[PDB]
Amino acid sequence: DLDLAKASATDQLKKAKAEAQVIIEQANKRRSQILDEAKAEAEQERTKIVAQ
Amino acid sequence: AQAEIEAERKRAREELRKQVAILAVAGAEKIIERSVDEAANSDIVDKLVAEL
């Protein structure tokens, strides 16, 4: 009974740790999209102003 | 974008300054050529020899 319980702990911890990494990957994907879209919107304002 | 616009405006004024000054002295040369006088020429000479 004791041996099975200790192995079940290590499964649960390791699985949560891995899920945290894909959670973080998706925030980086959002960040890299949001900042790239900021640059690509800002340039289309600057060019519009200076062409004016 | 606003820094870029003001800087080009400042350049345009200094350009316009370059334009007039050249054609102004090139005109003022012609005022000599059509308004020089031998008494005024002698006035230049007699002034500078008195302060050489």
Find the count of extended strands of chain A (DSSP E, 2+ residues): 0
Helix count from the secondary structure assignment of chain A? 1
Q: Note the gap between the termini of chain A.
A: 78 Å
Q: State the assembly state of the protein chains.
A: part of a larger assembly
Biggest interface found: A-B, 4 and 4 residues
- What fraction strand of chain A? under 5%
Proportion in helices of chain A: over 70%
What's the alpha carbon Rg of chain A, rounded to whole Å?
23 Å
Look at the helices and sheets of chain A and give the structural class: mainly alpha
| Global outline of chain A | rod-shaped
Give the ordered list of helices and strands of chain A.
Answer: H
How does the major sheet of chain A shape up? none
In short:
It is classed as membrane protein. This is part of a larger assembly, with two copies of chain A (52 residues). With 52 residues, chain A is mainly α.
Task: Give a written overview of the molecule.
This is part of a larger assembly, with two copies of chain A (52 residues). Helices cover 96% and strands 0% of the residues of chain A. Chain A contains one helix and no strands. Chain A has one helix at 2-51. The longest helix of chain A is centred in the middle third of the chain and has 50 residues, at 2-51. The interface between A and B is small, with 4 and 4 residues. It is classed as membrane protein. The entry lists the keywords Energy, ATP hyrolysis, ATP synthesis, Motor, Membrane protein, cryoEM. E. coli ATP synthase imaged in 10mM MgATP State2 "half-up. Chains A, B are ATP synthase subunit b.
